[PDB]
Design a protein around this ligand. Structure first.
Ligand SMILES: Nc1nc2c(ncn2[C@@H]2O[C@H](COP(=O)(O)OP(=O)(O)OP(=O)(O)O)[C@@H](O)[C@H]2O)c(=O)[nH]1
Ligand SMILES: Nc1nc2c(ncn2[C@@H]2O[C@H](COP(=O)(O)OP(=O)(O)OP(=O)(O)O)[C@@H](O)[C@H]2O)c(=O)[nH]1
Ligand SMILES: Nc1nc2c(ncn2[C@@H]2O[C@H](COP(=O)(O)OP(=O)(O)OP(=O)(O)O)[C@@H](O)[C@H]2O)c(=O)[nH]1
Ligand SMILES: Nc1nc2c(ncn2[C@@H]2O[C@H](COP(=O)(O)OP(=O)(O)OP(=O)(O)O)[C@@H](O)[C@H]2O)c(=O)[nH]1
Ligand SMILES: [Mg+2]
Ligand SMILES: [Mg+2]
Ligand SMILES: [Mg+2]
Ligand SMILES: [Mg+2]
Lengths: 429, 435, 429, 435
């Protein structure tokens, strides 16, 4: 019922997926062996949205793990939670793209997308009513970025009447993990802009700040970072995974938050985030949940909404609560924080309520805001790319495997046009 | 699964390879005789498995004179190596690049190419070549040129990494050193993806100051260079929180067809008695590695600008503190990057801590950093070498030897003009320019 | 009742039959010694079709084994599972045919053929109502191709009102086991298309691809390659050996599959084919079995069906299954793949259901489709024979044993005529 | 059951046969005295069982001089051979083709034929003949050509295979080889189904380079010959997944009645200490056997085309990788087939691993490849040898020894033009032709 397919690309994709399926197995009470061991029947009432049933009451994730380098697959196969995936899903190449868009989009891309499209067509056969696609990847690496672009284009070609959500790990503004980010970022951004539905931009240094300050962790690792990202994603999907007083789903979110075809870049957030020690000194309640959601410090993207205006906002709550407090207090938010809301969208508000709380907590909430503060991120990336390209550095190996200069020119022009439209729509009357 | 092969040329190459393969044997937990008592693939990258429990290296030892190869045969690593690869001629080139490239070099190049083809067809997912050779050595330079030409002809687009031995400015052991250097550099400028530089005087300074050893035989220097080699290769050989490959190294370090001359550095390099009184934190080892007194090429980057940097951390490591150290070093004043490279950093992490050899000069560590920097401080070394060569050649010394061994004058003239142009382009790119 | 006699010519036949009569014993619960030790009584109600009852409840196979050289019998006679054959059946000659057509059809095989016809006529003078003959020969060697063709013409005369099915092994396109394949192949087909009813063309590396890719085996020996040809062989004749909801038999397939007398070259296929570890992660049900049939990856003849159109298709299901799924999906196959079916045979699908599952599996099915993709198989063989005969290579060793260049004129001309009519029917309207 | 007899003539055949029949008893577990300590027929095709537990061979040892046969009687293999078969004359032929074919050949040819019909009637399913004769000598060339006339008439159409000893181009034991060779080939061209060519100078390179032995006596050289001999009949004596009989190669490797001159090859041939460091896989021994440095005739195949091929594996061999390894050979361009032979390979497999005789140069091995390729590279062998003989006949050197012993000058001209005809036809068919 409303089947959804998960696609993971690059090392980030595989790691985030491992943590995410950890979260899903814990939520639905699935043993690492693959056999149900829980007690509640509400979880099994709707178990087939992500998992698939198999003989001897086994459950197999609808996962498509694929990466050019085989190290990530070797790690995930040798480690725990490798006994429930189906081996046919595990696609791996011969060598990583080496942080090269050309190698990730033209050289191994052909064969790899052929194989992965065959696997996708096999997977979509079992689905009863396909709902949409999920793709978690990074815009910084080569294989994940370029091959995810090619896969997205071909999947859009095959399935026009369907939606896909992309969880992109945007490169951090303050620090760069690699050297040549801007070329890859600009090319992937242009391709996504032309051929995607919605994008939940997630940053890395903002999540570092969130994990250090709010959660008070001395040495946070990628395990904790991916834990938080997986929690956000599970909170997003629980709306149609679980019953609730006021339900919502992916198409509802998309129609509520894409007012224009070229404006679908979002900013997520999660609440509450409390340390193990400081959890007993605060009473969990809707006021502090909403107030913690609506402060920039608890924003998962490295941008400050104080410099922009919330174009639209979605709040997906969980646990058991009451719409009275939910609405009356988000109303208080709208009244108090009016100056940071757009004027030509009266009632720029969407709220949904689930019924099953997150594990080990009374109630939580997920925020998804479409704002104009991503404009600074796009313009900073544009500045870096235009400087590095006017020097013409690193260019002749992007040229050496298929590309040439006019593609870079057109990508820069398209991205700049998007920036200009974003700004002039923020500053409309 | 991704296979890289190592070609060791000259006496320096053979000794460095002996140290490097010793270090690999301790790293992968294999006995010298081939048996053994994350881990198991790893050794499948280097150690090809035979029918029995023995593993054999993918090394190709080649030399003209037979004495050093006889020594390595008689050494304690006599069972490990496959006896066929140890290719020996009969007489050395005697510090004559002409002899090592034209006269005798063509009579053994066929055999070494046949063995290279056999080993490369034996493997499955070949990655590239690692060439361990010196510059002063006539056989080293001549075979470097010949093997680069032959391998580039045979295999089109693969990785070709070199671990050279740069001639020292003040320390000197040869007289035809400028001639060998100019000829080999001109010949292999266009036939190498990325060539690292190592100098002996710099390693001697490092071993004297940082480690405080008064009797630094060649064993310690070879141990150091082997440690850098193992650190750069541990990314392929092991799994980590953020992996990096040789293609990544190339595409993140070298920005231009000709400017592919980085330099290596290792950290921490501290003694045994000083180990107890130190903390060995990520930030402090990062600062020590970026310290200009630890670089392994006798050129202080204060005279130039950094252009690209790659750092591999191995052991227990947190990406947050890695990020903090990188950001603070970026914001520091003395380190200066180029304007057109707003992001000049590439970080890799590995989950395998380095292992110290028994009886070694270094001490056991839980964190290690290897740094590879493409900068403009090598321009001064190129200029000094060019000046020495021009001064020597201004009155045609040893040219009778070189010409008698099948050479001309156009080769010298074109090598001179080629390195003049290369130095000019290097300086022009490194220096800041308006717009 | 409805008796059948099984013939094996050549080295392959004695090797294929070495495992064919292994699975039949397992199906009917027959010990190697020859005494029934089964429990279910549904096996013995029709046991006389293949096995022959003798004194003291000992059953002996109704098959004859023959070769010109004695090496093959010494393996099966002295080896295990050789205790149940009757020693009279083991006909062997003096010397091998030496990969020569003439030595197997004129010179050496003429002596032994009188010693095997007198066994065939003796073979079922006790057989109540003969259904037909099964022939398991090869098209590459001399004894299997040469005499096995001679045996067909002699059997055709004594039993004209009968059917025979040849489970031939047509030679491989990429690899030739022997140098002179095209001479033996073309000289054999010229007499096959005259006096045989139906033919199962099978390649060898088509089994290599299936075993390596689908079954995930690294070292497939002939013990495992021939084990899959046995499964297809048992599936075709399981309809008249066991009860079924919708039964078929060997005479039913021939009329449904041979629209014209010269067109009886088929393409077998089996499903499911799952490894020993990747089977717990897949639930066996009717949907994927039909999907696994029609993809070019899983077919036992190395010929891509995408370049041709199916003329007729027959699927023989097994196991226990509701019929609705069996036929509701062959409409979807006909609808989704409507471009791969001939137009002037509406409803070109035959189906049949048995009621006994294969050992160790919940259900399975067999596909036998008379396609036009055989067109490319005969072109390639006739192409190799065209160039080789022009230089008269190896010809000076065929003319010396009865044949002549006049014989080769008919073989190429009849092949050229046959392959043309095998194609212009596809292009007909 | 299917029986083949071996005719050994001359000290070449007897010395080869001394080690040739040394190997069969090892393969079938036969003690030198005939006692015993797959199995149970194995030996029934070679070892005709007698009344007692003894098994006697089916060999016909014949020579003119009583020298070489003497040590066979007095050697360690004294009881095994039946004392009647060792036919000996009184004096040799002295490298004179005329003496061994007209004068002293006839006075003894009637004695060997008597033992042939005696042994041919003793067997039931006789298949063919094995001949072990050289070319340079007199009793090995003139006398065996008499047999080819005598066996042909007595038995019309049976297998006639010769394991010759081709005279070497540079190596030359005798001085009248160009006279003996051309006279032999012309007479036995039309009386041979197929003649495997073996050169003596080629086996030195195999033993010196591939096996690394500095003292290759005839004992070690002849050991490398019996391995192919035991390989051609390795399918008759043992059961395999894909069997081959002596008419298979006879049918697969003879495209024309005249072009029936293949050349043997064996693999693997590696030393004892080098065994531990080799993987010894099916994929490489297919390549190892095919390399031009492993053939047993000094004629590099790169100069010509491969008319056909034939492979006989054994041991723990799986027919897939054999299919895989053979398939990739067509892609590699050191092989070059003729246009009218799109399919040009034959494969045979066996379940018996080869066994190494104790004290031999080879090491224990689980696989074996024995390639028999008819190729155009042998065309240069006839032309080069034809040039030497044509130089002799110009001034009629050494002729007076031949004419006075019972031959005519006209007979010499016919043998000369016959090799020109064979060379013309063999090259014309090998080279491409219009339409
Ligand atoms: N949030 C998060 N990001 C990660 C994690 N691991 C890696 N990344 C990001 O992923 C980027 C690396 O790009 P990838 O596509 O994974 O590169 P790769 O998988 O090594 O293969 P190539 O693209 O060919 O280099 C880095 O810039 C990191 O910012 C992780 O655990 N969590
Ligand atoms: N790092 C390091 N360098 C060495 C070592 N041994 C020799 N070298 C360098 O190698 C140079 C000598 O050149 P070689 O390649 O060894 O010359 P060769 O091996 O004698 O052969 P020819 O060049 O023909 O004479 C010296 O200038 C040293 O700088 C060593 O153990 N470690
Ligand atoms: N599928 C399959 N084919 C086989 C097997 N064994 C042999 N073959 C085929 O059989 C062919 C050999 O021809 P045969 O007719 O059997 O030859 P023979 O029986 O040995 O006797 P001759 O024809 O005289 O050589 C080869 O081309 C193989 O392709 C097997 O185990 N499985
Ligand atoms: N492979 C091999 N060849 C040998 C051996 N001994 C002799 N020959 C060859 O035999 C040739 C000599 O001619 P033979 O036919 O043997 O002469 P013969 O057998 O003594 O008979 P006569 O010519 O009458 O003396 C030499 O050129 C050698 O090449 C041996 O042990 N092994
Ligand atoms: Mg990667
Ligand atoms: Mg030297
Ligand atoms: Mg046979
Ligand atoms: Mg003699």
């Amino acid at each position: 019922m409303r089947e959804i397919v998960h696609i993971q690309a690059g090392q980030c994709g595989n790691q985030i997926g491992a943590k995410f399926w950890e979260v899903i197995s814990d939520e639905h009470g699935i043993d690492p062996s693959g056999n149900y061991v829980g007690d509640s029947d509400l979880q099994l009432e709707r178990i087939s949205v992500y998992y698939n049933e198999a003989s001897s009451h086994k459950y197999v994730p609808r996962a498509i793990l694929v990466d050019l380098e085989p190290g990530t697959m070797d790690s995930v196969r040798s480690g725990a939670f490798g006994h429930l995936f189906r081996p046919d899903n595990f696609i791996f190449g011969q060598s990583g793209a080496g942080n090269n868009w050309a190698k990730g989009h033209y050289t191994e891309g052909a064969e790899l997308v052929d194989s992965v499209l065959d696997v996708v067509r096999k997977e979509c056969e079992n689905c009863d009513c396909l709902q949409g696609f999920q793709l978690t990847h990074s815009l910084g690496g080569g294989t994940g970025s370029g091959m995810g672009t090619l896969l997205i284009s071909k999947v859009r070609e095959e399935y026009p009447d369907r939606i896909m959500n992309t969880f992109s790990v945007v490169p951090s503004p303050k620090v760069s993990d690699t050297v040549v980010e801007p070329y890859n970022a600009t090319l992937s951004i242009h391709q996504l802009v032309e051929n995607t539905d919605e994008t939940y931009c997630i940053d890395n240094e903002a999540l570092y700040d969130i994990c250090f300050r709010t959660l008070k962790l001395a040495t946070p690792t990628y395990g904790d970072l991916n834990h938080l990202v997986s929690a956000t994603m599970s909170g997003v999907t629980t709306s149609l995974r679980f019953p609730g007083q006021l339900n919502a789903d992916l198409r509802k979110l998309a129609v509520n938050m894409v007012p224009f075809p070229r404006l679908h870049f979002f900013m997520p957030g999660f609440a509450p985030l409390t340390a193990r020690g400081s959890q007993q000194y605060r009473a969990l309640t809707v006021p502090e949940l909403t107030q913690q959601m609506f402060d920039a410090k608890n924003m998962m993207a490295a941008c400050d909404p104080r410099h922009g205006r919330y174009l639209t906002v979605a709040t997906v709550f969980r646990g058991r609560m009451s719409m009275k407090e939910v609405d009356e207090q988000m109303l208080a938010i709208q009244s108090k924080n009016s100056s940071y809301f757009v004027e030509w969208i009266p009632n720029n508000v969407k709220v949904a309520v689930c019924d099953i709380p997150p594990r080990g907590l009374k109630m939580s909430s997920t925020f998804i805001g479409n704002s104009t503060a991503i404009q600074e991120l796009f313009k900073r990336i544009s500045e870096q790319f235009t400087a590095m390209f006017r020097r013409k550095a690193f260019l002749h190996w992007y040229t050496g495997e298929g590309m040439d200069e006019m593609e870079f020119t057109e990508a820069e022009s398209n991205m700049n046009d998007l920036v200009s439209e974003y700004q002039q729509y923020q500053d409309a009357t | 699964m991704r296979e890289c092969i190592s070609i060791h040329v000259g006496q320096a190459g053979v000794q460095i390879g002996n140290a490097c393969w010793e270090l690999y044997c301790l790293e992968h937990g294999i006995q010298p005789d081939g048996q053994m008592p994350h881990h198991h693939d790893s050794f499948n990258t280097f150690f090809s498995e035979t029918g029995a429990g023995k593993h054999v290296p993918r090394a190709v030892f080649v030399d003209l004179e037979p004495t050093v190869i006889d020594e390595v045969r008689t050494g304690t690593y006599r069972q490990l190596f496959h006896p066929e690869q140890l290719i020996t001629g009969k007489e050395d080139a005697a510090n004559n690049y002409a002899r090592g490239h034209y006269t005798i070099g063509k009579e053994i190049i066929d055999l070494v190419l046949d063995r290279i083809r056999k080993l490369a067809d034996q493997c499955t997912g070949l990655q590239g070549f690692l060439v361990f050779h010196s510059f002063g050595g006539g056989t080293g330079s001549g075979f470097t040129s010949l093997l680069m030409e032959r391998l580039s002809v045979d295999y089109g687009k693969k990785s070709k990494l070199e671990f050279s031995i740069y001639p020292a400015p003040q320390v000197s052991t040869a007289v035809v050193e400028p001639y060998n250097s100019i000829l080999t550099t001109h010949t292999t400028l266009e036939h190498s993806d990325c060539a690292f530089m190592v100098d002996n005087e710099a390693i001697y300074d490092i071993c004297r100051r940082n480690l405080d050893i008064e009797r630094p035989t060649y064993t310690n220097l070879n141990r150091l260079i082997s440690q850098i080699v193992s650190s750069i290769t541990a990314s392929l050989r092991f799994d980590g929180a953020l992996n990096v490959d040789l293609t990544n190294f190339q595409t993140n370090l070298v920005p231009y067809p000709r400017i592919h001359f980085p330099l290596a550095t290792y950290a921490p390099v501290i003694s045994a008695e000083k180990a107890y009184h130190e903390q060995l934190s990520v930030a402090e080892i990062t600062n020590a590695c970026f310290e200009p007194a630890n670089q392994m090429v006798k050129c202080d980057p204060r005279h130039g600008k950094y252009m690209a940097c790659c750092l591999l951390y191995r052991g227990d490591v947190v990406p947050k503190d890695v990020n903090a150290a990188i950001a603070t070093i970026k914001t520091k004043r003395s380190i200066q990057f180029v304007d057109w490279c707003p992001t000049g950093f590439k970080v890799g992490i590995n989950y395998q801590p380095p292992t110290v050899v028994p009886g070694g000069d270094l001490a056991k560590v839980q964190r290690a950093v290897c740094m590879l920097s493409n900068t403009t401080a090598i321009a001064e070394a190129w200029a000094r070498l060019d000046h020495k060569f021009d001064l020597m050649y201004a009155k045609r010394a040893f040219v009778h030897w070189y010409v008698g061994e099948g050479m001309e004058e156009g080769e010298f003239s074109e090598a001179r003009e080629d390195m003049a142009a290369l130095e000019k382009d290097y300086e022009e790119v490194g220096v800041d320019s308006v717009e």
